[PDB]
Amino acid sequence: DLSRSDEIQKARIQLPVFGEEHKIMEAIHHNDVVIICGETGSGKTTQVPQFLYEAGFGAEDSPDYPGMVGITQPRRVAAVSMAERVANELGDHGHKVGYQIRFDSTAKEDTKVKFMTDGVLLREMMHDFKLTKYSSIIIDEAHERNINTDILIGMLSRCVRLRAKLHKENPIEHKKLKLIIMSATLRVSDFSENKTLFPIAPPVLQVDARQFPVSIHFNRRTAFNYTDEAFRKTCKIHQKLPPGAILVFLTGQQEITHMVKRLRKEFPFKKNSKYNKDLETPVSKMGINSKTTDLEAEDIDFSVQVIDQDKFKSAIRYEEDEEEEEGFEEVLTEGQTANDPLYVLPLYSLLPTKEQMRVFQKPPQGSRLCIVATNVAETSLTIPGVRYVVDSGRSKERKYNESNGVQSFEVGWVSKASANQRSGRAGRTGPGHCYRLYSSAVFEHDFEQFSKPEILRMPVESIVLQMKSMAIHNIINFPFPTPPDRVALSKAIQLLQYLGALDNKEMITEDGKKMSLFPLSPRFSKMLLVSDEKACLPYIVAIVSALSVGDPFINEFELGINEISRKPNPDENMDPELKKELRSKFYKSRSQFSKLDKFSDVFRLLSVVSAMDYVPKEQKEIFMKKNFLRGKLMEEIVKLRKQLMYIIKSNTSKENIAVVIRNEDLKSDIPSVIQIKLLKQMICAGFVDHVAVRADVLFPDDAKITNRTSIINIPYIPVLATRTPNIEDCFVYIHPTSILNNLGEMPPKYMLYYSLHLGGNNKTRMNTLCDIA
Ligand SMILES: Nc1ncnc2c1ncn2[C@@H]1O[C@H](COP(=O)(O)OP(=O)(O)O)[C@@H](O)[C@H]1O
Ligand SMILES: [Mg+2]
């Protein structure tokens, strides 16, 4: 027999999924694949595994369902917390419940209900595709559309098909597999209507959760300093409004730690109270890297966007086209004071497990609970008693810049769907309030309706590399929920081959696996991997960071000081002396960063970035102004170098003991001559498919050229280019801003280019990196 406590079984009957047990189990008995949709707090994660367990799934001599019940989460916080909750709810059967969030954790013997991440199950499928240890797999939180979730759903479609075939043949020897996909929303047509996933559409069950009304309060304007605004709003809620918990939505650990410290200092418990160490978080993050667990966007610090208040405000100035703050008309109730202690706790994915469990316990009497969380608390779990939500409206998400191939992880607006999901957390126990730290205008105009599936926010070569690191062989025909185009997939496989991440039979190499460990686009990952020779790693880190952020050099044409037009075509129609003096100082400044190498634009980049570390704080602006630099880009490059250094150091160890890096660690020696030649080979490894040979070499005497041709007129041809019936439609040229223009000597024979550019219609121009010998 199974025996739960009175508290437990009475909590369960309130949950809307509990009431639909009948329809759910009926569908599961009649169908191998079932989709269940229900809002957060419905009881999906806690109750469906219990339904299966009570039905005999995993029972030690079940004739049809002896395998475990596996349930995946895209979020490891949810995996662990919801495992602990289900173990509690199973009473004297709770020992059957375990979890696994690390690759090399080996789970308990008697575990029959197993919570794990996405990536854990993907890895188990490498050793047993059929997942024979499992009677049922629940893919949870699918509406988040993380890349591993999409991949797992495709993999499981094949697995369930195969298990059904084998079970049809011999049911004593091969058991069926029940696949259940669970979603917070109805947006499941990429699963339910996808015929390559499910030839026969699975049933879609809807659970009708009862959410109390939540009053939505927009701020009048949208503050740039959202952490200060959230602190301010949280204090006002706490001091004026009746009992109930506060959930604050920030974007990452650093912000959360700082905000929790401010709140504890503002509303402490009495001096040397026991509670002022139940709140202590002596370890800000667990030792974690990509070798042991699947990094989530939230965990990765690699941001390339300039933060800038002026740019922010001008981007949203339409809100200035149209008195008290709304949502503060309720008052304190008896036994409350404006200065009650705040039982404030952090909640983010890097948080140690024992600390992350504190958020479900009741606050001590006479205090108010405040959870400062990332969007882990948006749909993946529920904090009891939340009456007030404070929404920064933002999150850290993966982004892919199509124009330059840079993958990064950036703070930006969430979708409207996500904002509404955040608000809803204030409506689980009773009517509540959500305080959005942004205007109704900004919400309307700049919050996208729906967030893009992560597969659409990735370099396709990253998608392919991840699947290949999971030993998924057939990429082209893989049943994606949202498939990339076959052409892009083929090109991505070929790129990974040029990078040596896939071999000639399209299988991952050892260097491929190492690259798959990095959160960067594979060209950059490759350059960092081959870089640990002759103390060259820091130079490559500087170069990758500069390329990721962008060109900090303001050029003559942007300064409006060019003597000759950018383009030679003769179309369209104080200041002079000053312009000539500006040109003088500009070419001097440029030359000052061109001393490491005479042919290589990438090394003038390295040069400014290196010089930047010797310019003390009070010189930055003078430095910037004197050198026509984009100071915000330079500062961002400093920050990114430090982030990337942390990423590498965290990867060297198995357990992360990487130390905070300080600005003084970036001080570089200027590279030696052989160091420079080597850097050129490393960069070339990242861009092997981008070499351009002077047309006069491949074809001498068959094409025009003269003694005094402008350098910018000297034709190059990318070796991998598609020769056309009329050839010259395919040549490319050196840009007039490059270092090469100051040669006079003839330009190199083999040049390495970052990319080619066609806007600016004279001719296709090269964005040059360096020469190849
Ligand atoms: N320690 C706990 N962990 C998780 N949920 C808890 C805990 N204690 C109580 N609960 C309650 O259990 C319910 C869990 O619902 P859940 O299964 O997470 O729904 P869904 O997965 O559909 O969002 C919540 O309403 C929450 O209030
Ligand atoms: Mg859930």
Compile the SSE list and pairings:
Blueprint: H1 6-14, H2 16-19, H3 21-30, E1 33-37, H4 44-54, E2 68-73, H5 76-89, E3 97-100, E4 113-117, H6 118-127, E5 134-139, H7 147-169, E6 178-183, H8 189-192, E7 204-206, E8 214-218, H9 226-240, E9 245-249, H10 253-266, H11 275-278, H12 309-315, E10 342-347, H13 353-356, E11 368-373, H14 376-379, E12 386-391, E13 394-401, E14 406-413, H15 416-424, E15 432-436, H16 440-446, H17 460-469, H18 486-498, H19 510-516, H20 522-529, H21 537-549, H22 556-559, H23 575-592, H24 601-612, H25 620-627, H26 631-652, H27 673-686, E16 691-694, H28 695-698, E17 716-718, E18 733-734, E19 750-757, E20 765-771
Parallel strand pairs: 1-6, 1-7, 2-4, 2-5, 3-4, 5-6, 8-15, 9-11, 9-12, 10-11, 12-15, 18-20
Antiparallel strand pairs: 13-14, 16-17, 16-19, 19-20
Helix pairs in contact: 4-5, 6-7, 9-10, 17-18, 17-19, 19-20, 20-27, 21-24, 21-26
Subcellular location: Nucleus, Nucleolus
Catalytic activity: ATP + H2O = ADP + phosphate + H(+)
Domain Helicase C-terminal: 299-471
- Which homologous superfamily in CATH is the superfamily of the domain at 6-206? P-loop containing nucleotide triphosphate hydrolases
Q: What characteristic shape results from the CA principal axes?
A: globular
- Our Rg estimate from Cα atoms comes to 29 Å
Write the CATH architecture name of the domain at 6-206: 3-Layer(aba) Sandwich
Ligand roster: adenosine-5'-diphosphate, magnesium ion
Strand proportion, as a percent range, falls in: 5-15%
Q: Output the number of helix runs.
A: 28
Helix content: 25-40%
What is CATH's topology name of the domain at 6-206?
Rossmann fold
Strand order of the largest sheet: 3-4-2-5-6-1-7
Sheet bearing the most strands, described? 7 strands, parallel
Structure class:
alpha/beta
Number of strands: 20
CATH class of the domain at 6-206: Alpha Beta
Question: How far is the N terminus from the C terminus?
Answer: 77 Å
